[PDB]
mmCIF file with all atom_site columns, C-alpha atoms in Angstrom:
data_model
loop_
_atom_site.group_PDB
_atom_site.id
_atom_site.type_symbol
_atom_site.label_atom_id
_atom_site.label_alt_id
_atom_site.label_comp_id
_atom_site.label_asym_id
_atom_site.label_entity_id
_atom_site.label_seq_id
_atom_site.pdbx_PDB_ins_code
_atom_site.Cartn_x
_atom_site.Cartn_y
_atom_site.Cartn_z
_atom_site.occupancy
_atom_site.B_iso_or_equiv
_atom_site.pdbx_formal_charge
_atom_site.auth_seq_id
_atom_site.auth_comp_id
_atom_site.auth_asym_id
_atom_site.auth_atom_id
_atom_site.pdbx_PDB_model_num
ATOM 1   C CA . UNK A 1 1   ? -10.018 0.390  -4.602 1.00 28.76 ? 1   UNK A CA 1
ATOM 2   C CA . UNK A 1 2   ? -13.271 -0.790 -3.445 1.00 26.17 ? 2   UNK A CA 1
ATOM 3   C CA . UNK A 1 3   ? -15.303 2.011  -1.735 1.00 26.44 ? 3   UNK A CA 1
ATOM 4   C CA . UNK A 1 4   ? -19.352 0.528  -1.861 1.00 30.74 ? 4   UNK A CA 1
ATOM 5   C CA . UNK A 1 5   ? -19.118 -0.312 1.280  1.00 30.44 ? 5   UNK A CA 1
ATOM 6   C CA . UNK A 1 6   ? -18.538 2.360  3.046  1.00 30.36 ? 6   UNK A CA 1
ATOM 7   C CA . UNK A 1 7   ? -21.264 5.052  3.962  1.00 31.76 ? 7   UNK A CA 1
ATOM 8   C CA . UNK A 1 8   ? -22.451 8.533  5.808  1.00 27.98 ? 8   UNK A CA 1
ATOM 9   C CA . UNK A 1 9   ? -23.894 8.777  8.978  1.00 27.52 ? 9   UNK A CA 1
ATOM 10  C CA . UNK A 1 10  ? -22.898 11.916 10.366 1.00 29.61 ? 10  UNK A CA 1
ATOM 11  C CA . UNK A 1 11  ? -20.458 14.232 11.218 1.00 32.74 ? 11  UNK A CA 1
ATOM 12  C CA . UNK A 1 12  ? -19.452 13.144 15.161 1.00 31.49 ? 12  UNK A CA 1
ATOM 13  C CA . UNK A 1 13  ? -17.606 14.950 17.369 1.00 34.29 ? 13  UNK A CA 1
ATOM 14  C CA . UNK A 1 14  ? -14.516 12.972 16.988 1.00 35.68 ? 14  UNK A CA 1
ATOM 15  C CA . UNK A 1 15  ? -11.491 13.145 14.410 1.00 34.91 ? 15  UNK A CA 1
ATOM 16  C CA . UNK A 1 16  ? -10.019 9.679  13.135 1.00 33.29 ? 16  UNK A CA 1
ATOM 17  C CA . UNK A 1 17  ? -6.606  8.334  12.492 1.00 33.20 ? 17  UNK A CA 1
ATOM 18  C CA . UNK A 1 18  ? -6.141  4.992  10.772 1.00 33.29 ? 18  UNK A CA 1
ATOM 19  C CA . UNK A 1 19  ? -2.306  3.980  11.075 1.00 34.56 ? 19  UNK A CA 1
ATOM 20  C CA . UNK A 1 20  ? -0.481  1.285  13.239 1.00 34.84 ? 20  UNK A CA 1
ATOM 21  C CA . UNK A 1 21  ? 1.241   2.676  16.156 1.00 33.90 ? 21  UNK A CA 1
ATOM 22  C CA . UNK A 1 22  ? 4.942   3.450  14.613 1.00 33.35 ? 22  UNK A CA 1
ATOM 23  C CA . UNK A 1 23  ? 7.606   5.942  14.180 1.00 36.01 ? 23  UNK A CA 1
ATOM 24  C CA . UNK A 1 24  ? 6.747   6.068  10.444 1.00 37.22 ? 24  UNK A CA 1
ATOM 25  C CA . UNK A 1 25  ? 2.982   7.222  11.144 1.00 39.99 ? 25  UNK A CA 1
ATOM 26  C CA . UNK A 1 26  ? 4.010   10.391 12.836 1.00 38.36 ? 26  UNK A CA 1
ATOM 27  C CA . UNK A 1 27  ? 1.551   9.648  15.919 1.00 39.75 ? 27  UNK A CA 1
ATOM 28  C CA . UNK A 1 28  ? 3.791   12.154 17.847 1.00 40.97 ? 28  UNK A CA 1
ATOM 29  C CA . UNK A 1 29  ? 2.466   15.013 15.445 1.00 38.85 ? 29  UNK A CA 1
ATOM 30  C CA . UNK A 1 30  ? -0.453  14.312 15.881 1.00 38.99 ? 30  UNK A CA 1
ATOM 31  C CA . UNK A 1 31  ? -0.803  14.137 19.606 1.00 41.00 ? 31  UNK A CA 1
ATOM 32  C CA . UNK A 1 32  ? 0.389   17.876 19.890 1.00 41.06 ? 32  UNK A CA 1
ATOM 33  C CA . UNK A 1 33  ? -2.206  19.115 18.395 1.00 40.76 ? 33  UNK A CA 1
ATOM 34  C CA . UNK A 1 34  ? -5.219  17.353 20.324 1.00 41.24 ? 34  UNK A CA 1
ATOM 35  C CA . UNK A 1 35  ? -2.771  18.448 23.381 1.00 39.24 ? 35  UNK A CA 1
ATOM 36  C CA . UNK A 1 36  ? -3.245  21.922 21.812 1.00 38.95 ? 36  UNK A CA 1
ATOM 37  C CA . UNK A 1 37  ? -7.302  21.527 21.123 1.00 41.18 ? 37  UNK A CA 1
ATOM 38  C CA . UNK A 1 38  ? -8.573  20.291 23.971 1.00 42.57 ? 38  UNK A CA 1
ATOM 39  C CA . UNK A 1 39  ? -12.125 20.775 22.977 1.00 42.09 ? 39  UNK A CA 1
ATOM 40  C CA . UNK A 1 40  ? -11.604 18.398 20.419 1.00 39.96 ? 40  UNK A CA 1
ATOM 41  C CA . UNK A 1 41  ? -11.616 13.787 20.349 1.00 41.86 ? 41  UNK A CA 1
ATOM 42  C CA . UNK A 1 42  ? -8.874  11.449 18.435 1.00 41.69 ? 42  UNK A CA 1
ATOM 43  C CA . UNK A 1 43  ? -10.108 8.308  17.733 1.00 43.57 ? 43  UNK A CA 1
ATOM 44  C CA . UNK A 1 44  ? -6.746  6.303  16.682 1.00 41.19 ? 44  UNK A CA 1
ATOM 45  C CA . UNK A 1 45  ? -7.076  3.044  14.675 1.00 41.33 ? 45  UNK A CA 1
ATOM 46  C CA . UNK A 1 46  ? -4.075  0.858  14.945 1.00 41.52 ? 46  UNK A CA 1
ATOM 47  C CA . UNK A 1 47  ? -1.999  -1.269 16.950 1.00 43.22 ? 47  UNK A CA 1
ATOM 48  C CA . UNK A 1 48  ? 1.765   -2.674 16.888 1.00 42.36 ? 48  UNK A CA 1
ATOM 49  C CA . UNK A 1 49  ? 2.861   -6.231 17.468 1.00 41.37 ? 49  UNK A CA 1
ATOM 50  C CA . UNK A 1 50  ? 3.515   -7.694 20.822 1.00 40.10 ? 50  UNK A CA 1
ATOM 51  C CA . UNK A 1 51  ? 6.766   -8.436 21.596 1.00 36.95 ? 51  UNK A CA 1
ATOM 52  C CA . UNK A 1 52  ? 8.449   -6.552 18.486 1.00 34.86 ? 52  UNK A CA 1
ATOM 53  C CA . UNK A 1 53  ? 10.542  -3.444 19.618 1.00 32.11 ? 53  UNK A CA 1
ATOM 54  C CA . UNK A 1 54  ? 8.220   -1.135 18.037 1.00 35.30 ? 54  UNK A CA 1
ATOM 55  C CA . UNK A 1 55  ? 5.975   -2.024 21.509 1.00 35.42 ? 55  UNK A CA 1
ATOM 56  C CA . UNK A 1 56  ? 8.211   0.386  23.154 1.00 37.00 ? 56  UNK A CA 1
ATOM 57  C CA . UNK A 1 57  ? 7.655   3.344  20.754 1.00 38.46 ? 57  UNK A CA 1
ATOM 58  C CA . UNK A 1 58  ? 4.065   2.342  21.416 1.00 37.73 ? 58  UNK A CA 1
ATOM 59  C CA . UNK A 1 59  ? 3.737   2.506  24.827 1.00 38.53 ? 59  UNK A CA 1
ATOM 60  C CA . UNK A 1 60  ? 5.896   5.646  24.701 1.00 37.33 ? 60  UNK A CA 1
ATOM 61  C CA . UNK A 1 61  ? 3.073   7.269  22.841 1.00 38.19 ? 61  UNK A CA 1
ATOM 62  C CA . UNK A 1 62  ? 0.358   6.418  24.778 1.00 40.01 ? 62  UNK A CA 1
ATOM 63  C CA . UNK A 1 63  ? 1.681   7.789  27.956 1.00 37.74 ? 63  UNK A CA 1
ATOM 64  C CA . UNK A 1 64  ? 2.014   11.020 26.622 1.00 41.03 ? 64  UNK A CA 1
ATOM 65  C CA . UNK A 1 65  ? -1.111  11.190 24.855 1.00 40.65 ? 65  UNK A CA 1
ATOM 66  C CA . UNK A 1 66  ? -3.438  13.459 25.952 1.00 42.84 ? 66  UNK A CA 1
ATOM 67  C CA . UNK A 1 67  ? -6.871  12.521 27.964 1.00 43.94 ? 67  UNK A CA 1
ATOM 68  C CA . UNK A 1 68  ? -8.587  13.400 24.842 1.00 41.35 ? 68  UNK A CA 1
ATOM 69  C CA . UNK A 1 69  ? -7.240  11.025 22.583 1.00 46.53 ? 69  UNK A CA 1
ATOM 70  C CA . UNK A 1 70  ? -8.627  6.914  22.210 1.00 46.82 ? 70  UNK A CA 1
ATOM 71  C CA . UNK A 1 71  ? -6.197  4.429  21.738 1.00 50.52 ? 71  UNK A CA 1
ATOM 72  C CA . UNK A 1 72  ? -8.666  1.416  19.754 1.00 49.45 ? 72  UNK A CA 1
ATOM 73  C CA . UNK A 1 73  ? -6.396  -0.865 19.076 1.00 49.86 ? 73  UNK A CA 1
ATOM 74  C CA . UNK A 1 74  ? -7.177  -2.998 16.115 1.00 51.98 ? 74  UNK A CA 1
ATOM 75  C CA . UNK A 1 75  ? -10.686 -3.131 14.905 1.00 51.20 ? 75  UNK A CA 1
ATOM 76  C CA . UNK A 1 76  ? -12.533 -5.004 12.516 1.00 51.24 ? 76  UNK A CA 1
ATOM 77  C CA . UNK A 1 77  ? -13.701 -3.887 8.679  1.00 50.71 ? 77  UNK A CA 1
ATOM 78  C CA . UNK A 1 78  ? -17.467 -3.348 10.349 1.00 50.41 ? 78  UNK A CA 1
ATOM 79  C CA . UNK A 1 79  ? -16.093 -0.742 13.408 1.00 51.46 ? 79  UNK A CA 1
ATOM 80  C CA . UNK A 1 80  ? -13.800 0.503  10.673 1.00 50.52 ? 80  UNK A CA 1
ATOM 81  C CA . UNK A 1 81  ? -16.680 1.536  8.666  1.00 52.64 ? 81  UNK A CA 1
ATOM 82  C CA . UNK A 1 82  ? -18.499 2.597  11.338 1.00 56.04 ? 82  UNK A CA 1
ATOM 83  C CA . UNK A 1 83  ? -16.121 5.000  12.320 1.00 55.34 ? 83  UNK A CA 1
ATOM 84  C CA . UNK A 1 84  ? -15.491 6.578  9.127  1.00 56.09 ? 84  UNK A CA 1
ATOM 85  C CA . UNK A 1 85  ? -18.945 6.836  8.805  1.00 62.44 ? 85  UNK A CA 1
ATOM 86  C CA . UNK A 1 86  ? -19.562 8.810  12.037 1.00 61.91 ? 86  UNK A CA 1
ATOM 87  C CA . UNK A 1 87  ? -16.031 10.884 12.230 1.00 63.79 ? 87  UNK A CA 1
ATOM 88  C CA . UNK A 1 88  ? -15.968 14.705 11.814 1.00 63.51 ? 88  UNK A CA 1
ATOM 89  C CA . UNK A 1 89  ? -12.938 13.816 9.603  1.00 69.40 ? 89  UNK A CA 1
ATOM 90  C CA . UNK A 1 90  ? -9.962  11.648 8.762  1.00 70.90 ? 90  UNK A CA 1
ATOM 91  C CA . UNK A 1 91  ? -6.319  12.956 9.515  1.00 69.64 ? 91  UNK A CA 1
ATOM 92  C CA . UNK A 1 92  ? -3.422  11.580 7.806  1.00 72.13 ? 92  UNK A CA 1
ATOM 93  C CA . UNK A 1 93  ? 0.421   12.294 9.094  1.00 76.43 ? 93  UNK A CA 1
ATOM 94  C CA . UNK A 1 94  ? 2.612   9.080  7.641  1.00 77.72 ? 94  UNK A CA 1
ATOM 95  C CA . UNK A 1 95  ? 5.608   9.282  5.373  1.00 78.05 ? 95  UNK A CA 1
ATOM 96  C CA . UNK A 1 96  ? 5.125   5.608  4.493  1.00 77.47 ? 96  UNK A CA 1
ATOM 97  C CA . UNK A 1 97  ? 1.645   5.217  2.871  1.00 74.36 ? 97  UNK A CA 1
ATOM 98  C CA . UNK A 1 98  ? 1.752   6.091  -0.765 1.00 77.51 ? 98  UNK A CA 1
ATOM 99  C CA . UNK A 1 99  ? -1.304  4.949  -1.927 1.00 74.83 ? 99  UNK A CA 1
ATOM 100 C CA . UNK A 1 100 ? -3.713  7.218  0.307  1.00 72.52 ? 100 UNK A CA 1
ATOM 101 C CA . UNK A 1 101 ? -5.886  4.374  0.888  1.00 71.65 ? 101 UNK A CA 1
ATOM 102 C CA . UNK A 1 102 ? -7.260  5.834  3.904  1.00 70.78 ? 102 UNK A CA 1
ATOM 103 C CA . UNK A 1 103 ? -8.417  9.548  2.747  1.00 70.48 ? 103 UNK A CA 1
ATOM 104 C CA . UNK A 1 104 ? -10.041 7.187  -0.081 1.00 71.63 ? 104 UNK A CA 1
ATOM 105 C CA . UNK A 1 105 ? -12.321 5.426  2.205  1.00 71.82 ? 105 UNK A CA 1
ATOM 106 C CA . UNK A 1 106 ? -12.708 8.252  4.085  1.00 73.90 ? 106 UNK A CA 1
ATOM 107 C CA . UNK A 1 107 ? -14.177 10.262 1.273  1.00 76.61 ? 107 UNK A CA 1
ATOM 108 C CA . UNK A 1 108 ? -16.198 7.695  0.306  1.00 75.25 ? 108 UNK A CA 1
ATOM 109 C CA . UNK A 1 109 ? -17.990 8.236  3.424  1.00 79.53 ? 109 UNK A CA 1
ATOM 110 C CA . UNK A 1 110 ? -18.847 11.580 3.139  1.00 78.67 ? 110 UNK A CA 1
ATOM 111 C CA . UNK A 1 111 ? -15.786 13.075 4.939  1.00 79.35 ? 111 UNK A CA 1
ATOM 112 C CA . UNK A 1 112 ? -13.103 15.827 4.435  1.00 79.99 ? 112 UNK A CA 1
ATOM 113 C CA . UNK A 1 113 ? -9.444  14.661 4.627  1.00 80.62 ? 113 UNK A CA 1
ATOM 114 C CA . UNK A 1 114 ? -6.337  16.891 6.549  1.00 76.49 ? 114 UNK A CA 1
ATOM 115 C CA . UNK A 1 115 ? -3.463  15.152 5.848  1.00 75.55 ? 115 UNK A CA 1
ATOM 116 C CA . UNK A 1 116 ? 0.187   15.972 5.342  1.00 75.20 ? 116 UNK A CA 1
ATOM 117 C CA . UNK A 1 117 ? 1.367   16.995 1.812  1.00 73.94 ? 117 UNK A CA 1
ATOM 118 C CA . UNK A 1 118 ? 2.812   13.608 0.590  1.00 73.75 ? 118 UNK A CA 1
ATOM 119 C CA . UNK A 1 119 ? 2.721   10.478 -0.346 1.00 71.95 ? 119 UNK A CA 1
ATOM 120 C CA . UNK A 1 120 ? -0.914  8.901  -1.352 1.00 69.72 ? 120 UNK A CA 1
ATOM 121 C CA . UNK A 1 121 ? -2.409  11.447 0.409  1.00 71.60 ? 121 UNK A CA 1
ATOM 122 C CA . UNK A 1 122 ? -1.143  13.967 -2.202 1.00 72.53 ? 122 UNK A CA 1
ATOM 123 C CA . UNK A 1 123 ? -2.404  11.683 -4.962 1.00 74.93 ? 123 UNK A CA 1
ATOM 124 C CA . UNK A 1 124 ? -6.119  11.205 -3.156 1.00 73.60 ? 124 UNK A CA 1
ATOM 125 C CA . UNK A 1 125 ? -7.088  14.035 -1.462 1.00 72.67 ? 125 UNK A CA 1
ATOM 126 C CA . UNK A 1 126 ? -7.956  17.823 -3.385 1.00 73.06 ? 126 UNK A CA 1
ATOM 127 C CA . UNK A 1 127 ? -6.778  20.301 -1.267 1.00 72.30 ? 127 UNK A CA 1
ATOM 128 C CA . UNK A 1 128 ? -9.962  23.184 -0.296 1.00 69.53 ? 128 UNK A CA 1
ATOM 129 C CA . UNK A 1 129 ? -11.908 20.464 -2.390 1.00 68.76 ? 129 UNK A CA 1
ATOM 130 C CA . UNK A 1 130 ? -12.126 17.482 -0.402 1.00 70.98 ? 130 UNK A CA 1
ATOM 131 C CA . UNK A 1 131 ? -9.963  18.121 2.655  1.00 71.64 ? 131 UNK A CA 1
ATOM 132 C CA . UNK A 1 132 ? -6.761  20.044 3.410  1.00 74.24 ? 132 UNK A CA 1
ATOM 133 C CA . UNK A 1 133 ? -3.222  19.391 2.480  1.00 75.82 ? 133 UNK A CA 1
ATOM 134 C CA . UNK A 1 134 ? -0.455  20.752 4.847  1.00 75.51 ? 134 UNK A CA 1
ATOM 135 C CA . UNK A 1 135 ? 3.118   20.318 5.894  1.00 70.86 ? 135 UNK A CA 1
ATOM 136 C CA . UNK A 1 136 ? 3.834   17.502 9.117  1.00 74.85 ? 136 UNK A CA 1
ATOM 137 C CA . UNK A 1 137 ? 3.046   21.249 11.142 1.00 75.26 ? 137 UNK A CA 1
ATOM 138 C CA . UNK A 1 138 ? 1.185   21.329 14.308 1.00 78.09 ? 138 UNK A CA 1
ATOM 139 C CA . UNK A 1 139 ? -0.231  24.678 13.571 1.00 78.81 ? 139 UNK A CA 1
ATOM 140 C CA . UNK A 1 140 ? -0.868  24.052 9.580  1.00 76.42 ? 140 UNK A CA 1
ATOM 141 C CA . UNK A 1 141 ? -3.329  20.999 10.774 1.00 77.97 ? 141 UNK A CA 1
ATOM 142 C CA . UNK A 1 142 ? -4.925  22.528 13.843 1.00 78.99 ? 142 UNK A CA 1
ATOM 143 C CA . UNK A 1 143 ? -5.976  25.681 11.276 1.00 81.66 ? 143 UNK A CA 1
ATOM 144 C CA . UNK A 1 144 ? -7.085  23.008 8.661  1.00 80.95 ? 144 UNK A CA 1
ATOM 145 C CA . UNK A 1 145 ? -8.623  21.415 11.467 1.00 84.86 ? 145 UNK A CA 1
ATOM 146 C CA . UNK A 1 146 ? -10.612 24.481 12.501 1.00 82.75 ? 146 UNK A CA 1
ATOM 147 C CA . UNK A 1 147 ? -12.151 25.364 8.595  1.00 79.54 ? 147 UNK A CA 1
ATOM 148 C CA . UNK A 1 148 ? -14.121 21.784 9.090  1.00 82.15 ? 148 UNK A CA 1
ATOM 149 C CA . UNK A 1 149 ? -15.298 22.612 12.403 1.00 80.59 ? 149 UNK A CA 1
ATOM 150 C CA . UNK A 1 150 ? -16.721 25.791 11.219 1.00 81.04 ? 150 UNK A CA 1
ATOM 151 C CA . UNK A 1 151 ? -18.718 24.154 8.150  1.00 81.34 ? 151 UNK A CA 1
ATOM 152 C CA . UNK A 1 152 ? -18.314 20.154 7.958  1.00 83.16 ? 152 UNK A CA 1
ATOM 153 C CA . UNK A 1 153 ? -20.408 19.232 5.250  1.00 81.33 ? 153 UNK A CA 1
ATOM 154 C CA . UNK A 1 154 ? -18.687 21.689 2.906  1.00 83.04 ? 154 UNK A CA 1
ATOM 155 C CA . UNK A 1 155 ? -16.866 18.892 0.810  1.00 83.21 ? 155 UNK A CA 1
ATOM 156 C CA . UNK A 1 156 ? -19.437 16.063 1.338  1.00 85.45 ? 156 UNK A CA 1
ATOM 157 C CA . UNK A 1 157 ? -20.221 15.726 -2.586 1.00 87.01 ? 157 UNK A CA 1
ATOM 158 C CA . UNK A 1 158 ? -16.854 16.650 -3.724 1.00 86.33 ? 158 UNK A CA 1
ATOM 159 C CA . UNK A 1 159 ? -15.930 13.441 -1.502 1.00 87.45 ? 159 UNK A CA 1
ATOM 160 C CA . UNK A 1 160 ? -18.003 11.098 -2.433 1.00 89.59 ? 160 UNK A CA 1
ATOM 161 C CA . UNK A 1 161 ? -17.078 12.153 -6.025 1.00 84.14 ? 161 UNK A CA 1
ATOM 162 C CA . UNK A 1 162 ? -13.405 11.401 -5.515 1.00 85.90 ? 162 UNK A CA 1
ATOM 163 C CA . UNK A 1 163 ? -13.657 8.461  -4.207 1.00 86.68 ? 163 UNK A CA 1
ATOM 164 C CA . UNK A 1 164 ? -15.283 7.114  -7.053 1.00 89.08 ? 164 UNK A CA 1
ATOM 165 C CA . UNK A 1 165 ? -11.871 7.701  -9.167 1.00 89.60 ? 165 UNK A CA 1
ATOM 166 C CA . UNK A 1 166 ? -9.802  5.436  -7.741 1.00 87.29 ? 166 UNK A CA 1
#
């Protein structure tokens, strides 16, 4: 997994998501809990394919997403980067990604990982080392959620450090 490109900017003011808009990805789950903290920003990465019945799931989910979460769409490999390198922090929620590609590139950039207890995001991400790993619960995230608000640059090394292991 190539992770040289990727970089730190800063810890924004908005979490990220990178998954395609599907049952799989859990995008209900995480919905609630922006619904929940409303003095938090989802940026969600993704998109589903026109025409193909997952469009209705899709446009399910948008309608009851909350004001404070940004549906981008798909973006290109330079916003991607971009956006890891500016998010307070990545969250993962699908059952389908076993590599944990995303928390990868997300530490590489600096940035602490809450994701869901399996898959590739067991395998990627240390939990109270470089991120938080939880159970697909609304409250279990929003707590994990609220340690990185408190002190963001806590894992930064221990991030960059991972990354370079895969």
């Amino acid at each position: 997994v190539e992770t040289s490109k990727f970089k730190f900017k800063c810890y924004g003011d908005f979490w990220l998501s990178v998954n395609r808009i599907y049952p799989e990805k859990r995008i209900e789950l995480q919905l609630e809990v922006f619904k929940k903290l409303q003095d938090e920003k989802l940026y969600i990465v993704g998109w589903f394919s026109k025409g193909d019945h997952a469009e209705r799931y899709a446009r399910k989910i948008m309608k009851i997403a909350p004001d404070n979460v940004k549906f981008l769409g798909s973006v290109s490999e330079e916003e991607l980067i971009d956006l890891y390198s500016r998010c307070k922090g990545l969250l993962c929620t699908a059952k389908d990604e076993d590599f944990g590609l995303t928390p990868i590139e997300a530490m590489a950039s600096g940035k602490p990982v809450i994701a869901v207890n399996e898959g590739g995001f067991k395998e990627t991400v240390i939990n109270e080392k470089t991120g938080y790993l939880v159970n697909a619960d609304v409250n279990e995230i929003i707590d994990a959620m609220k340690k990185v608000s408190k002190n963001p640059d806590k894992f930064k090394k221990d991030c960059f450090r991972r990354a370079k292991e895969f």
